Amino acid sequence: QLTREQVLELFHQRSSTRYYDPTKKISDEDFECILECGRLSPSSVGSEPWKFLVIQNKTLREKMKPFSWGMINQLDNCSHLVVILAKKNARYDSPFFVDVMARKGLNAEQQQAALTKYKALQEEDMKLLENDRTLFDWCSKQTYIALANMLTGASALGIDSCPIEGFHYDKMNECLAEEGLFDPQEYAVSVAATFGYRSRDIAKKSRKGLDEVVKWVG
Amino acid sequence: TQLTREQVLELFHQRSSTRYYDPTKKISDEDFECILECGRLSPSSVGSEPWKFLVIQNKTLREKMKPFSWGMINQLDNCSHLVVILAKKNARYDSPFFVDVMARKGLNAEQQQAALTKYKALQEEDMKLLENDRTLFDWCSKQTYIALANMLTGASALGIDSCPIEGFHYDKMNECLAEEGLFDPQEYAVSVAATFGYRSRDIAKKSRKGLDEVVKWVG
Ligand SMILES: Cc1cc2nc3c(=O)[nH]c(=O)nc-3n(C[C@H](O)[C@H](O)[C@H](O)COP(=O)(O)O)c2cc1C
Ligand SMILES: Cc1cc2nc3c(=O)[nH]c(=O)nc-3n(C[C@H](O)[C@H](O)[C@H](O)COP(=O)(O)O)c2cc1C
Ligand SMILES: [Cl-]
Ligand SMILES: [Cl-]
Ligand SMILES: [Cl-]
């Protein structure tokens, strides 16, 4: 439990860190807790379509620099780097969704019902089976939930972070797949995040005002 | 604001998706503004904040949604607050939308030209978002899922229950909300929703994949 003022200050204190102290490393305990915040995240129909690559290998980090302009300095100095993958071809009738149902412990009639629920959602409600990319982006949207909670959970632990889109996705995919780090038919890169301890004061928040981003329908 | 690893874990564990709300309990105006603030303060790619939070308290409007909102059809009645998050359509690097983005960063003329080439690279080449309208909308949509997550977590921290909602016909929803004059359908479309309030059944146990299945370590 937190007060209103603390809840606010938690989201004011979290800022995108572009300069890490290279003399400070996150403890294994603290980082596993950050990862737990991602794994515990909610996801459409319990799909959990994420995978978290923790890239600590200096050599691999250096390989990413030339195509990762968004984090080119952070690559060198951050404690931890997480590249989040999202599941490809996450169709209602896929072995992937066979597992989803197995985790939910559904019997045979419930599974035919769940499947008709997933079919209408993908095909008609959200029109996700348009092409390969729309279905992938649906899973990727769920991984942005994990991303957000990892940033928030880290900040609560006193750990700074930066979410990262600033890299060439085709090359990053090829780089990690060539390392044998995932099956390029099953997964692709969604988004990444650095973690560590900042070296500079937090810059104050610049957002649109509440009255511009909220519309009340009474 | 600081928490032990024990409390952080409990924070993300205590947050569950509630399907059954108690219609007696209503969130205070102070608490719910706090929840909204969690979305508004969320990070977003190049600071684009491409969301809009529609707060649907109108009881008549909530019923009109039920016939195509199977994911929340019971919840529409009993939940305290309902949020439909919109994402910006066609948030191209060269759009008026990105004129505002740059002004909020206080960029000068030289800084704006450099930023514009950075956005163009990001959208056109690094992320390949400009192939069509839907890929570019979906990118903004992804950023709104960050505001979604943080509103759930902030709600949880205040003792307030939530449920994220994709279970509705998007076309019918976009149409319904746009006909009610709630947004410009050329400028925004529905991205995701979320109900807020207090639960009426017990919190359920979490079924997640193992940490060993979802984490791959590269040391
Ligand atoms: C998905 C996404 C990707 C981002 N990619 C980058 C990036 O690659 N490099 C960078 O320095 N910041 C990046 N940012 C951080 C944003 O620029 C930042 O969140 C925004 O300016 C608001 O500032 P704040 O996070 O300090 O509140 C990204 C943010 C998000 C959520
Ligand atoms: C984007 C999103 C959409 C969801 N859509 C629905 C929905 O339509 N109806 C619903 O009751 N739950 C919905 N869920 C809830 C998930 O099924 C639920 O989060 C998951 O099974 C994990 O349980 P937990 O959130 O209680 O940990 C959605 C979740 C998310 C993140
Ligand atoms: Cl950087
Ligand atoms: Cl400092
Ligand atoms: Cl509008």
Author numbering:
A (entry chain B): 3 to 220
B (entry chain A): 2 to 220
From the reporting publication:
Phylogenetically diverse bacteria can carry out chloramphenicol reduction, but only a single enzyme has been described that efficiently catalyzes this reaction, the NfsB nitroreductase from Haemophilus influenzae strain KW20. We found that expression of H. influenzae and Neisseria spp. nfsB genes, but not Pasteurella multocida nfsB, allows Escherichia coli to resist chloramphenicol by nitroreduction. Mass spectrometric analysis confirmed that purified H. influenzae and N. meningitides NfsB enzymes reduce chloramphenicol to amino-chloramphenicol, while kinetics analyses supported the hypothesis that chloramphenicol reduction is a secondary activity. Previous kinetic studies of nitroreductase catalysis revealed that reactions progress by a double-displacement (ping-pong) mechanism that appears to lack the gating steps necessary to impose specificity, explaining the substrate promiscuity of these enzymes.
Previous work has demonstrated that the NfsB enzyme from H. influenzae strain Rd KW20 (Hi KW20) has the ability to reduce chloramphenicol to amino-chloramphenicol in vitro. We previously demonstrated that expression of the nfsB housekeeping gene from H. influenzae KW20 (Hi KW20) is sufficient to confer clinically relevant levels of chloramphenicol resistance in Es. coli. To understand better how variation in the substrate-binding site mediates activity, we solved the crystal structures of the NfsB homologs from Hi KW20, Hi Int1, Hi 86-028NP, and Nm Z2491. We compared the activity of each NfsB homolog against Hi KW20 NfsB because it was the only previously characterized chloramphenicol reductase. Cell-free supernatants from the empty vector control and Es. coli strain expressing the Pm 70 nfsB gene reactions showed negligible derivatization by the Bratton-Marshall reagent, while supernatants from the Es. coli strains expressing H. influenzae or Neisseria nfsB genes showed robust signal, with the strain expressing the Hi KW20 nfsB showing the highest apparent reduction rate. The relative increase in resistance conferred by H. influenzae or Neisseria nfsB expression ranged from approximately a 16-fold increase (Hi KW20 and Hi 86-028NP) down to an ∼2-fold increase (Hi Int1 and Hi 12). The divergence in chloramphenicol resistance and in vitro activity likely reflect the vagaries of heterologous expression in Es. coli and suggest the presence of important subtleties that still need to be accounted for when estimating mobilization risks of cryptic and proto-resistance genes. This is especially evident with the NfsB enzymes from Hi KW20 and Hi Int1. Intuitively, the Ser68-Met74 pair found in Hi 12 NfsB would provide more of the flexibility needed to properly locate and orient Trp71 to make space for the ribose of NADP than the Pro68-Ile74 pair in other H. influenzae NfsB homologs (Pro68-Ala74 in Nm Z2491 NfsB).
